[PDB]
Amino acid sequence: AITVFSPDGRLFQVEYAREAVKKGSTALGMKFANGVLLISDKKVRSRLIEQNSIEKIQLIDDYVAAVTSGLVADARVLVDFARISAQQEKVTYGSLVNIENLVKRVADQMQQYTQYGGVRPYGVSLIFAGIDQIGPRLFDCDPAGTINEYKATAIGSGKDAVVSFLEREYKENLPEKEAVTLGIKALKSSLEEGEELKAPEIASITVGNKYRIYDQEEVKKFL
Amino acid sequence: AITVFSPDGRLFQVEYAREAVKKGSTALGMKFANGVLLISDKKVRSRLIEQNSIEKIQLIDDYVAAVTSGLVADARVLVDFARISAQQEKVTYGSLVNIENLVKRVADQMQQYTQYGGVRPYGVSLIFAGIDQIGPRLFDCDPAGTINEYKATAIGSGKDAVVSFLEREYKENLPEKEAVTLGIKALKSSLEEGEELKAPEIASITVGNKYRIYDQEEVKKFL
Amino acid sequence: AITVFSPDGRLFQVEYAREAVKKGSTALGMKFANGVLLISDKKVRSRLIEQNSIEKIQLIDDYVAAVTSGLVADARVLVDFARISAQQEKVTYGSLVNIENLVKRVADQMQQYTQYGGVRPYGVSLIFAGIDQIGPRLFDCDPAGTINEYKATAIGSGKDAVVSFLEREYKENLPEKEAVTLGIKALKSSLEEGEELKAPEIASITVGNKYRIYDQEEVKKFL
Amino acid sequence: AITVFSPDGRLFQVEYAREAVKKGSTALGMKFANGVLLISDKKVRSRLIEQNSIEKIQLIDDYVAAVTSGLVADARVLVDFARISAQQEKVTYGSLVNIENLVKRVADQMQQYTQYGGVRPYGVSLIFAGIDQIGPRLFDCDPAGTINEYKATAIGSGKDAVVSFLEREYKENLPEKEAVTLGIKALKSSLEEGEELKAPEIASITVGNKYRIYDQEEVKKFL
Amino acid sequence: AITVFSPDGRLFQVEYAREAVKKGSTALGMKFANGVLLISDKKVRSRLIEQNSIEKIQLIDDYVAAVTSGLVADARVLVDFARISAQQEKVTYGSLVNIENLVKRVADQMQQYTQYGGVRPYGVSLIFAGIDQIGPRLFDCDPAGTINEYKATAIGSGKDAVVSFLEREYKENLPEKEAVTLGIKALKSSLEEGEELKAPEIASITVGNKYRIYDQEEVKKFL
Amino acid sequence: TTTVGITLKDAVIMATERRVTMENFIMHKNGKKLFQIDTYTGMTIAGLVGDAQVLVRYMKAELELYRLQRRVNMPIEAVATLLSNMLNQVKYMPYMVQLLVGGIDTAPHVFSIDAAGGSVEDIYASTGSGSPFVYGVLESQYSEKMTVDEGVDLVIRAISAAKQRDSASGGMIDVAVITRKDGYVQLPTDQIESRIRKLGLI
Amino acid sequence: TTTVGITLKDAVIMATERRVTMENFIMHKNGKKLFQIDTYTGMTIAGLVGDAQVLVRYMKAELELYRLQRRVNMPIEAVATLLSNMLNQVKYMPYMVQLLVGGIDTAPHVFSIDAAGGSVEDIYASTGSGSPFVYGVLESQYSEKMTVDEGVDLVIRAISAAKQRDSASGGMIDVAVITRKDGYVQLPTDQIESRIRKLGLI
Amino acid sequence: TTTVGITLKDAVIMATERRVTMENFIMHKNGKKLFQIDTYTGMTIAGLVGDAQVLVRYMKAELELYRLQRRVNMPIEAVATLLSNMLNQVKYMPYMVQLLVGGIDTAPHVFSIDAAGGSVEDIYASTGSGSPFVYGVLESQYSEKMTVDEGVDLVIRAISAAKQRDSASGGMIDVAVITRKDGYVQLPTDQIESRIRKLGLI
Amino acid sequence: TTTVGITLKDAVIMATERRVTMENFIMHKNGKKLFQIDTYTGMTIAGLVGDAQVLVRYMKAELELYRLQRRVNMPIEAVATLLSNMLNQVKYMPYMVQLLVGGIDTAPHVFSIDAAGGSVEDIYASTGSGSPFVYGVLESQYSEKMTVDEGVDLVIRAISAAKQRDSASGGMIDVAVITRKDGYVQLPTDQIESRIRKLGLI
């Protein structure tokens, strides 16, 4: 086995996977009036890249979306797992009543890869956001399988800076437009010194409606 | 294999898991007149956290509840296991006569993960409390799978201080209200020096009734 | 593999498990006129402990009982195994003619965990006592799977002192009351210097009868 | 396990496989007006080699082609896997609508070989190009299983030089002939100092048509 | 696992197996007018050996033959595998259209033994020669599973010297007799200093005919 | 056997008789065929007794576990869907039962489920050998505007008619009323008897 | 075969005859069909002898293990439930038996269980080919207010009537009385014979 | 049961009745046999209810997952092909159903699929016991040049004729219209009733 | 169903009709029974539609993969051999089909394959319920020296005769011509109709 207890009761392989997540791109999510939104920073690298299929925000179904950070290959595997898990619940019961159950299924898979030798832990953190029978939900999940629910949270390299900005300026029941504006300011605050902020990805959903992916022009009128 | 005997007859991986439990939040339980109660300390960290789904006290069924400390991801796995185990007993026999059997099933699972290579031991301690055919019961369970039954016990970082307070002031057949008052004092005694005591989680059950989760206002009138 | 031969032909992991047994509580058993008895020392630790479910003496069936020492979690697993083994014999044949066969099944399980890599050896010693077609029997079993039959024997931390006391004062065909009195004296001789002897657990069985668990008052009239 | 996290959150075995890819031959692909093209450098080694079955560009089906770099034996295994995966999709649905799904199946296989002990990661990078329902596509895939989509990209030893040349001179919607001419110039720019450029392999496909393998004479009229 | 990537991207166990092949006997093959031929050096060791069953050239079927070098025991296993693979193709389709497919099946087996822990790589190199629907074919295969097609090639200890001789004197469409004469000269050039050249093994096949094993007298009239 | 379930404005009423035929005679005159399986959910069973009792135990465990894991009761339609999947999965080795599921989540619901997993929602339904007699009563007398008290009298009359004509049915009538305000309430037999006298059914 | 179990105020009475047909003739006139399976629990068997004897051994082991692991006796309803699950699990490859389970946990109980796992509690029950004759006697003479002594006479008369009319039944009658105060008590044959003379049954 | 699907210039029209026979009588007069399974795809079911409902759930999950993974809707022909593979894979342990799949990807399409996985595209098709009566109406009155409004009237008349002659069919008619411009639109019952009066079908 | 395949000097001609019986009536008048499975290879199907369509998909995938892996098309005899192995491997759980495979590798070939994997090469062959009528036409009129144009007229006449006498056959005739110079060419229906008028077949 690889993931074993250290003398002080720590799992080093889990800690090291957390370092891998610290290198990923920054993403954030927050709850607003009757809804929830997700933002992911799309740093431009080269003109030669097809900047249409980046798709940092991935739909799990019409009412659930996720954003990830860290090892991108491991992240794709977990997103696929979440989509299959969501479809299995709908087949068995006819609907998805609580998003928290779906997150726990994903986090249980991640926990399993920290207890059994012969495999390594996923180097990914995820944020899940959507609408269920209880209303707007917002969770994250770390490589160890730890789950928490937030009014607002962030992942990635700039997570510490974005959270501190949200720790001072975030409000509840904000309108969609104002909430999106607040999100950009938090994202801009973590930017590398005097770097410019390129067009990020925006998605939002409101009670009674399906997910909405913001168009490029709509995002353009926010910088 | 990882968990092997040391020259003096000790299992180091089991000992190290006990260190992980020492970092968990403090929880306690005690028996009172015709019932048993559970208390878990809900330390507030950030405003951004949704302090409704913390749910430190988890119901196994309507008459059995548990509180855990240590690796939270491992704790969620064991709680799920306990719920499935409880439902299996009810299907086979039509009822749950002795809570001790349910605890042993959980502790046997934990013991297994200390004897076979390729896996590591759960880094969790649990307290089970409820009513069965024998009456009010209160058990704990450690990472090695050791089980004990108590009139009153505690787990977590402040366990040593809380137990010492209970070792001097605990009484039997105390009324519910007085027992709850005593529990808060024990919890306050282990607090970090002059730290304040935020609203914890309270649950109780009485012979003939189901479990009761204390409301926020009810907990508020105890500080 | 972990349990391998040392250059001098010793199995270190087996030896180390024997050290774990040396830390367990002291227990003893002896044969008397038409019967056998078991005694286990119940050291009191805290008032907060429910001193009713300690049950150091465990019934395998109505005519067979056991006491263990060492890793308590491993001991519970082996006791469960013995109970299932005993029930399987009764189903196949309709009765249990020789207790020695049941002990060998338990010791074969323990021997297996010393020869195959990927597992560690049980850190337990056991004493089995009961009545079968041959009459009163008394065996012990060590972590290696070694079995012996005795007129009187002891396990645990105080085993060396208790055996030496029995080596000089034990008699055969003693009446039940006198045999129990002799057992207390042996137990008191191993006590930590001038420590007091708290109420231990007593069980006995006589040819033609089932096992008897001594009541607290009956034990009280022996100190 | 072999592929484990380093203290800084890196997978060394994955990094080392990337070094193996750096030793492979240089290949490139770019999108042009209503199509996509692939170029692979066929360095001549010996007259004794049968320079007809080199086939650096491998057809996955009539509309999808790939080029690889690195461990050639591992590359052949992955190409075979891609062909079987493509045929399975056609059997199930009757057609292949999105090439991206086929690439993800290949990259998921490669990701699996980085998380489970007992196997090593594939030392290959691949470029997939073809026409699907969305139009012309161009992807690459690295040993970790990372996927990206490009207007133009390169793999192999000369990848850094070729990409820099494309980073300055590449245009969109270029005619086939001009795009092929641009590709040769990028390939010639990475050549070892004053080495000559031997006849490489060229393949192209246009919306509505199948893949075309350029004949030797056609390639000859490009140097 | 044993075969893992080195820091510079190399598989040491594969490299070491290549050293084992370097100790094997020298063999060669070349294409001639409407056919292909194989030569293997039969160094005489002792009179006590039965020099009839050496059979360095092994028939895979009537139209396909192979020669190997390196670990002779591993070579026998791979030859057996090739014969079974060839028969399976004939059963499924009724014929063998392309020898290259048969070689890839053998090389895929060899590649597998370089990626999965618990096994070591075959220490063998092989040359396959025969006639199929495309005509005369000549391949080799190395321990890594690398395949190449040649007009002429060699394996074994003297491979470097024989190839250099062929690199300067080999011609195409040579008659059978002249091609065989050229092969002997290449074999003699690699001989240990002034060692004599004993009667080697010769096999050849021509379009429309089956394989021919040269008789001892026929080989004798070539030295 | 005769079971029935009807929906009213904001209530569900379910009822059965109690006769259990075994060994081809009336061995048990006081069986149980109506079960509460959740806080606001009930279930009636017809067919093989052993198969039905096993299914009741499975449903109680699954619904209880669902409510603990997701903090809300399983919706009635999801209860029917879960049952449909389990029955269909063994359709060639089937539970030979006919089931009725009724309850309240945000509106009253009654579902009928057959042995092959076919599940259909209806305003009212009836199962067992006495069911055709019940449908005659319901067709001529049921009204959506009935009060709860009127509905209880209706199901009692319907089952009484079945007991007069179906030899497989008999015994005392059990009735359950499900509302959001009061939950699952099993009517005590004393009121059932009192209504039977008041309705002239002796 | 004829077996019977009845419940009184604070007691359970169980009784069988002893004739075991094998090879289509009366091979064994002195079989055993009534077994104690727990401290306050009894069991009667009808049907295939081999299947029934295997089930008796399984139940003795399970109940004994249960009592050791949980420090209390298994409740009678749980005993019936455990049996129901085992029989239903092999319903298509079944134990061809009919069983009666009776005992005391906090009140007397009698349960009837069929081959498919159907389990129903009743105040009294009877199994075997002689059972219809027993039900006639019980229907006309059973009373809940009977003393234990009256109940023993009743079951003896019921089984004697079955022996006069069912050729598959015969032999001496075995009777067991279960109470909390006295536990499982097998009546000695001498009192059974004495009662038979006193009741005029020769 | 009667289901029908027809293709027009740039539209697909699908329609069913609602009668669900169970226990050999008309238990449910208001069943559901027409389902939307994708943005521009619909499905009708005939045969065993349990088998059909399971298939509907499977198709909804697969199509939804497909659209998420590949960013486009599954083409109608691929929908039919996927169904054909699943049914044929269990041909000796089959889903006893007859299915119609219709929708728009770049042109309208209707596919008929049988229990053994045979899939055939057609301009129009009909399933269920009432289908032969529908084919008579379609053969004499269908025209490819009909407007959407004319097509809706045609399918309504065809199903009404089947209800007059096939006892297994009955109830209110459900109709869905699929176009690229408007998507999957379930016609409200008020217009269905209004058309029924206008066409003289009472 | 009626399918036919004939060999000429350097060509293969294959042809079918289009009627697909399902649910014991003429549900689809425009089915497809002739498929191109390789560059110079064709296939006709008779029997169970679902089994045949699955086989067509399998053959397209295998032949395509073969050609990619070995750089040449699979020879026609190898195509027949591969089919023979697959069918025989499940002979006791069989695909209930009759197949014709035709194509050109270095000479024209036609193979007939039955459900048990028996494969026989022939100069011409015919399958389906209309085949006996086709063999009568071919026996009296076929000649190895016919031109391609004469052969197309011959197969058209043969299938037309079958349609007059086999009720299971009907619809428009599809024809494919396979040559090395031109490859697999599906004759457009306009020429098929024109030939039908010219031959006096209305």
Residue numbers in the entry:
A (entry chain P), B (entry chain Q), C (entry chain R), D (entry chain O), E (entry chain U): 11 to 233
F (entry chain W), G (entry chain X), H (entry chain V), I (entry chain b): 1 to 202
Give passages from the manuscript.
The ubiquitin-proteasome system (UPS) is a crucial regulatory pathway responsible for eliminating damaged or unnecessary proteins within cells. Central to this system is the proteasome, a molecular machine that selectively degrades proteins. A hydrophobic-tyrosine-any residue (HbYX) motif on the C-termini of proteasome-activating complexes independently triggers gate-opening of the 20S core particle for protein degradation; however, the causal allosteric mechanism remains unclear. The architecture of the archaeal 20S proteasome is conserved resembling the eukaryotic 20S, but its α and β rings are homoheptameric rather than heteroheptameric.
The structure of the N-terminal tail in the closed gate conformation has not been well resolved in previously published structures of the T20S proteasome; thus, our high-resolution structures of the WT T20S (2.1 Å), ZYA-T20S (1.9 Å), and T20S-αL81Y (2.3 Å) provide insight to how the gate is stabilized in the close and open states. The WT T20S map does show clear pore-central densities that are expected for the closed gate. In addition, our WT map also resolves the N-termini up to Ala11, which includes 2 additional residues not previously resolved in the closed state. Our cryo-EM structure of the WT T20S now resolves more of the N-termini in the closed state, showing clear density beyond the prior resolved T13 to also show the location of I12 and A11. In this T20S model, the T13 side chain occupies the space between Helices 0 and 2 and I12 is seen binding to a hydrophobic pocket created by the neighboring subunits N-termini comprising A11, I12, and V14. Prior studies suggest the N-termini of the closed state in the T20S are disordered, but our WT structure shows a high degree of order up to residue 11 with residues 1-10 being disordered, though still occupying the central channel. For example, in the closed state, I12 is bound to the neighboring N-termini’s hydrophobic pocket, and T13 is bound under Helix 0; then in the open state I12 binds under Helix 0 and T13 binds near V129/R130 in the other neighboring subunit.
